[PDB]
Design a protein around this ligand. Structure first.
Ligand SMILES: *CC(=O)Nc1cccc(N(C(=O)c2ccco2)[C@@H](C(=O)NCc2ccccc2)c2cccnc2)c1
Ligand SMILES: *CC(=O)Nc1cccc(N(C(=O)c2ccco2)[C@@H](C(=O)NCc2ccccc2)c2cccnc2)c1
Lengths: 305, 305
């Protein structure tokens, strides 16, 4: 029993982290097979970030201008390419610690683990979700750029995020491993505002099922509702619309608990309209939305890797 | 910026996890040098747990009765010993992945990372604190026993916890790596109730400093207080007494923020007496108490390993 914000074990990813230094900038890179991936703004000075022309700044860069360090050993860079907003640095040597891996682009609401690193060295691991406005609420200091987000199914690491920017409001933006930003953000130090940070409804419902599974039951009301009626309430509270796809995803948790999805929806509606009255659910006084239905099943079943 | 519940990177510990099976029971063990550590109730049947005599049950156990599995390879057990509530299984082979390590017994209020495992395989990592009643609020299913808690300073893993029991209230109890339980708990399936789960005052204060560092400032009031006056309020709200030792520990965070420790104490007192009024601090609607002052400095400085 018990329910925690749980990250994936990070060992497979720790073996992939290197330091990348170009000119004055040092950040993190991801070493898989014979390629190091890192944010392309490694090539920028501080003043370049206000209005960078990356293709122009890249003319001034040769293979030997990128210093790539794995522990205390230097990798030999034998080619480089800019793909969207990431640099790919081809190196002499394949990472002997390369796990089975894939690059995936995730959907808003999906969760992943972040291995925060500085100077190529792992500092900590935590769990994130891609927000509906395509930011993430991370923990990233200067030097953390190039840290990655990932999921593991088995022996296979699915990389989905690389850290690039902190917005002025202290939330974070970055790319998939093909270099495409999530959302409309860019790697420039300019005015960029996030958009409404709406709540991931299907995840809240998943977490309410997790609460019931762990014995937290006080919020289970005597009502049901409909998708349309619930969604009228969801709109008011800046919750994401609940779709039939979401109901389908919640099916196994409904089966495990005997609580129909729409019954849980009506309990959630009562929590939104009346608050928690100073009570807690699974140790929180807020409705938590960074567990997916898959996360709950995984944690509640003991799925291993 | 940003502040997350952050676990240590788990790779060094993942390489230490094995499966231990004795008779009918399978759980996790920790393989360091040529010794595997695991909970001694691996030798019990389900009915033994109601009233086990471990020394008597151990007479029936030889080296070859303990099956120790690292991945798909079997370790050869060449000796075994019961030390308090852990079994030490001497094996043929030193773990080639043994990190620099130490065994430490932590104090209530101190935090650590747990690598939850099943059948010797790592399933996830999260951050815990040793509660003042010497339970931990974990996420542990059947089969998770033998999972360990740890801190890392550098290349050195300090193991402080091994998981043994779930109480009827769904909280958790276990031992240090010398086999001594934290608190008065025992490895028997009997009535054991926890004690008051008081709030770790010095950690709440640390987390309030983290909030200020990250721009969450609304709770900073116009008052100060004294240790004695604050503690009168702490008693009322089931908070641990704040000592001068605690004030000393908070010194660096006071210096970083320019906010005197007793000023923060008075802000905390106002939060306890008046609530948060539906506001949040660092994304929580509760006063979070599982970050130590050291944790905050570490996360807020980018300390790596
Ligand atoms: C995510 C990450 O790691 N970013 C990073 C990495 C190295 C340097 C920097 N910059 C810093 O300013 C800095 C201070 C201490 C260490 O690093 C940035 C940056 O913010 N540049 C623009 C700027 C700075 C201050 C005011 C206005 C504009 C940076 C420098 C060089 C290249 N890219 C980013 C951040
Ligand atoms: C922390 C952990 O891993 N505990 C663990 C590991 C293996 C078995 C078990 N027991 C189970 O009951 C069980 C069910 C499915 C898988 O495991 C326990 C146990 O709880 N025994 C006593 C009991 C059970 C039910 C009612 C009353 C009393 C166990 C079995 C054998 C040895 N130790 C523990 C738990």
């Amino acid at each position: 029993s018990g329910f925690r914000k749980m990250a994936f074990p990070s060992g497979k990813v720790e073996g992939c982290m290197v330091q990348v230094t170009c000119g004055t900038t040092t950040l993190n890179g991801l070493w898989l097979d014979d390629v190091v991936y890192c944010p392309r703004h490694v090539i920028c000075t501080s003043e370049d970030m206000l209005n960078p022309n990356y293709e122009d700044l890249l003319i001034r860069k040769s293979n030997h201008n990128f210093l790539v360090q794995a522990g205390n050993v230097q990798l030999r860079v034998i080619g480089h390419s800019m793909q969207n907003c990431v640099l790919k640095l081809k190196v002499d040597t394949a990472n002997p610690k390369t796990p089975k891996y894939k690059f995936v682009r995730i959907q808003p609401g999906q969760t992943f683990s972040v291995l925060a690193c500085y100077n190529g060295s792992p500092s900590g691991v935590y769990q994130c979700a891609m927000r509906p406005n395509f930011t993430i609420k991370g923990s990233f200091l200067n030097g953390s750029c190039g840290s990655v987000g990932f999921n593991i199914d088995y022996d296979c690491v699915s990389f989905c995020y690389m850290h690039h920017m902190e917005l002025p409001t202290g939330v974070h933006a970055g790319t998939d491993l093909e270099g495409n930003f999530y959302g409309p953000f860019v790697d420039r130090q300019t005015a960029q505002a996030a958009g409404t940070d709406t709540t991931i409804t299907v995840n809240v419902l998943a977490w309410l099922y997790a609460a019931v599974i762990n014995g937290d039951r006080w919020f289970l009301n005597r009502f049901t509702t409909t998708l349309n009626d619930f969604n009228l309430v969801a709109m008011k509270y800046n919750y994401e619309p609940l779709t039939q796809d979401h109901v389908d995803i919640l099916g196994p948790l409904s089966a495990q608990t005997g609580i129909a999805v729409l019954d849980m929806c009506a309990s959630l509606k009562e929590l939104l309209q009346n608050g928690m009255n100073g009570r807690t659910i699974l140790g929180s006084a807020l409705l938590e939305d960074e567990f997916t239905p898959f996360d709950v099943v995984r944690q509640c079943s003991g799925v291993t890797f």
